[PDB]
UniProtKB/Swiss-Prot annotation, chain A:
Quaternary structure (record): Component of the large ribosomal subunit (LSU). Mature yeast ribosomes consist of a small (40S) and a large (60S) subunit. The 40S small subunit contains 1 molecule of ribosomal RNA (18S rRNA) and 33 different proteins (encoded by 57 genes). The large 60S subunit contains 3 rRNA molecules (25S, 5.8S and 5S rRNA) and 46 different proteins (encoded by 81 genes).
Residue positions where Phosphoserine is found in the record: S47
Subcellular location: Cytoplasm
UniProt superkingdom: Eukaryota
Annotated protein name in UniProt: Large ribosomal subunit protein uL2A
Name of the coding gene: RPL2A
Extra information: There are 2 genes for uL2 in yeast.
Free-text function comment from the UniProt entry: Component of the ribosome, a large ribonucleoprotein complex responsible for the synthesis of proteins in the cell. The small ribosomal subunit (SSU) binds messenger RNAs (mRNAs) and translates the encoded message by selecting cognate aminoacyl-transfer RNA (tRNA) molecules. The large subunit (LSU) contains the ribosomal catalytic site termed the peptidyl transferase center (PTC), which catalyzes the formation of peptide bonds, thereby polymerizing the amino acids delivered by tRNAs into a polypeptide chain.
Source organism (scientific name): Saccharomyces cerevisiae (strain ATCC 204508 / S288c) (Baker's yeast)
Swiss-Prot record, chain B:
PROSITE patterns: RIBOSOMAL_L44E
Protein name: Large ribosomal subunit protein eL42A
Chief subcellular location: cytoplasm
Other remarks on this protein: Present with 13600 molecules/cell in log phase SD medium. There are 2 genes for eL42 in yeast.
Modified residues (N6-methyllysine): K39, K54
GO molecular function annotation: structural constituent of ribosome
Modifications the protein undergoes after translation, according to the UniProt entry: In wild-type cells, 78% of L42 is monomethylated at both Lys-39 and Lys-54, and 22% are a mixture of species with either residue monomethylated.
Gene3D superfamilies: 3.10.450.80
Effect of P55Q: Confers resistance to cycloheximide, an inhibitor of polypeptide elongation
Record InterPro entries: Ribosomal_eL44, Ribosomal_LSU_eL42, Ribosomal_zn-bd
Oligomeric form and interacting partners: Component of the large ribosomal subunit (LSU). Mature yeast ribosomes consist of a small (40S) and a large (60S) subunit. The 40S small subunit contains 1 molecule of ribosomal RNA (18S rRNA) and 33 different proteins (encoded by 57 genes). The large 60S subunit contains 3 rRNA molecules (25S, 5.8S and 5S rRNA) and 46 different proteins (encoded by 81 genes).
Species the sequence originates in: Saccharomyces cerevisiae (strain ATCC 204508 / S288c)
Classification via PANTHER family: 60S RIBOSOMAL PROTEIN L36A/L44 (PTHR10369)
Gene label: RPL42A
Amino acid sequence: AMNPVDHPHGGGNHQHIGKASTISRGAVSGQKAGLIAARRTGLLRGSQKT
Amino acid sequence: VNVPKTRKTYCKGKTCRKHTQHKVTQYKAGKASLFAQGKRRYDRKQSGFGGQTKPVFHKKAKTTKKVVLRLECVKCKTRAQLTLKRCKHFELGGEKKQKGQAL
RNA sequence: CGCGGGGUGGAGCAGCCUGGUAGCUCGUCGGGCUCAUAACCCGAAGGUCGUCGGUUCAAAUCCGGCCCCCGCAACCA
RNA sequence: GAAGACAUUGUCAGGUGGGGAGUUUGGCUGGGGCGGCACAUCUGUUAAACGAUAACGCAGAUGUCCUAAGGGGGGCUCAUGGAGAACAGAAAUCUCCAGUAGAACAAAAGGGUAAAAGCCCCCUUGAUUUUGAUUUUCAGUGUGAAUACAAACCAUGAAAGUGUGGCCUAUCGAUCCUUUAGUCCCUCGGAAUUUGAGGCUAGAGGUGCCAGAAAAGUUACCACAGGGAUAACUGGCUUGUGGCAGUCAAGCGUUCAUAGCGACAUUGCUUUUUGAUUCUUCGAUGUCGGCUCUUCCUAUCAUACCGAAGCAGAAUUCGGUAA
RNA sequence: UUGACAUUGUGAAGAGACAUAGAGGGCUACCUUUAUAGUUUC
RNA sequence: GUGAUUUCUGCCCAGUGCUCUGAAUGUCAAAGUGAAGAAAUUCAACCAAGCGCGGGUAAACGGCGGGAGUAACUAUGACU
RNA sequence: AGAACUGGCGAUGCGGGAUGAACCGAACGUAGAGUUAAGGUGCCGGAAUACACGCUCAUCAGACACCACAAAAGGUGUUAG
RNA sequence: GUCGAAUUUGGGUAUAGGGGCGAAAGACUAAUCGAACCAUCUAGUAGCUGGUUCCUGCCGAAGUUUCCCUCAGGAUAGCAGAAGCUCGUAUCAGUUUUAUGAGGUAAAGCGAAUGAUUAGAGGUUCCGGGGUCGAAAUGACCUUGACCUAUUCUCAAACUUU
RNA sequence: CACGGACCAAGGAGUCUAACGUCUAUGCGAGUGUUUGGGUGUAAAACCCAUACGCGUAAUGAAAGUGAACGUAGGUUGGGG
Ligand SMILES: [Zn+2]
């Protein structure tokens, strides 16, 4: 809900992410906004599987 | 195109100065070396900071090159060069066109 | 571009390294099976084994070149 | 206590790296964008009988192709028509007559060419080597193409002669760098030798925006210098189209061209459509519509008076003076 | 972020390659190899 | 990221991402190693991370289209 | 909108086309006299309400190139063939 | 509109310009914000706009060539002026005549090549399509299509003898 | 009905420099230039001066290098005087 100057996710004629919100470990301060280092995502189906 | 594997041109060998046989081979440029003043000047110019410092050519327009028939005299080994018209497919292997046979 | 691999019926994969007769799935047909239909079996055809050349007692296979595609890296006219 | 010569710390190297930085993101153009290439070029025409000559004028073509489709020589004559032969007919192969090109000579087209420049056979690389002059475009610069020569080495043919790519007019590329051939020469400057390097002459790698930067978008958050050299209002020229109006009369109208209509044609008008254009205006003439109010036009809906009827009356239709 | 070198020293097991010997296959090259008076990397 | 409650959140991991095995004649820097050299040097093998390969993930970013044959009026297609 | 040859305007006044960058005449020191160009001569307005032969009456006449518009088709209007 | 709280507000204090702060409008950060203000670099650069100062005399243009990331700009040739130089009526001329060439336009032409194009007439099919007499014939008859001959009407920027 | 100008005074915009091209004037001339510096001075002037130094008298080759007369310093043509 922001402007592109203020956030990676800001801007655009519709409110949307645009690119993947899953962000790498090697990303730098400024690029790390969203779901850090996620191995999976979605809805938690299954057990912990640890 | 198609050229023979032997070719008879006037020779400049300071002993031949005549028509002698030659051996034809399509010319390959040759492994670029360092230690030529251009390369060493380039290295120091690239080093440090400043990014790229010389142009790199992107707007390629042509699709052929000029095939160079470099010749080797079989009497005095004095090698010579000739240049051909642009072509797509070139090959030294000489097989002769026949007209009696069908297509 | 430097290195490397692949091309097999109408389509899709084994067989390459083993140098010795090219297999299977779908497709097509004919026969068989069931009292029938389906299904299931069996057989015929289907790949110049991409092209040319070399090596060998003998090459789809090993090697050289060419057509296409793919992978990483590279690139001061 | 834990860890332990691993972490950490220091330097160098590879990957990642719009988090950030800087920059770039053609031209012509009936405004720009889209489109296209009129950007480098070639044939015929426009082109107005030397030359030259524009348009996003017309019909097209080029980034190739060819060890022969290059060079020399010899022999033969093409397309097609007519008449004939088993299968064999409109198209097979064979024979004769006729035959100025009505065929072919890579492609685009135009010239040219017949004992050839065409088709078949033979030999070869003259598509070789050395630098100069010249034509075209033009600045009498470059590049490409070509012309005629001079000094060598050859091919063919008996020989005369011809042969410095393609029967001619297109078919292409500077500086710097790299790389190759040649000269095996000059230099590396305190003196030597050898590798290495740099020089000298001729090629190749290429710039297609083609006399040749190394280059992605967006802005409806926007900025600046300008332009009426340039668009979106009005106005002005035009009138295709829009709208309106004539002439002719094949026909409709039972019969009868013209009461009322009217095909095929054709001649005009208007600026209340939209186009075409780009003259004014970009140091700004307030771009819809409505409301309000005045005036003007007539191509007249009504009201006045009339003419004509397929006008008995009624209603209606056509037309005139009239705003 | 990854590697290398330095900070940064002190030792044994397994694996990898060289110079002493060596049984089986090709005057004298090599592999299945095995312990080192010795040198070497995970 | 979405935006009280209620109710439901379907199918898709090919793509761009992200994330995991590393069982690797794939690629691969500096160093280090070997050969040739008279040396500068050239060559060759080897080689971290990363990429590539192979799994997971859509309440990640997103996507959810054609075509052919068929039902006893046609039409249409539960079926393939 | 785009060209060819030539002449012009741009860069240029003056006489004329009422008026006008481009037409016609003519190109320019300051004056006087005379004569003309193109255009004109009822009055505005300098200059013959000159002369001669015809034609036209228009209940939207006509009136001088560029230039400032009018066509086809019609008329016992009138004139000459 | 809200009005007992995600309430209102003072003072203190913290956060400073590619930085803060943001219940997110690119909002606010001293009337300044899609990067504050102050000084300096800085007379920043402009192929673009505007201006650019006394008189008289003489001469007097160009909007055209070619090249250029060239099209509101430059370079270049040309047009112009100035300085002159060497000679003194000529190796001259936006002109005519004579003699000699060249050209493919205007016109013309199609009972001439190419292409287009109107109409009939006469002929031939062992070899066009049909109807009649025929089992058929390389048998015959009528018509239609092309074909040939002599004519006929009309044309061309990329057609042409002249 | 394109832009600036309500009015007036004062200020207000092609300069200087280093290096250069053509032309000109002046001097000396195969030379040329005193003024870096020195001497001297009535003192930022005027006057005098060596060694040096740049440019010219020699060019052509990347270079190593070599280096400008057959002749009345040529012939033919035109040439002022
Ligand atoms: Zn020789």
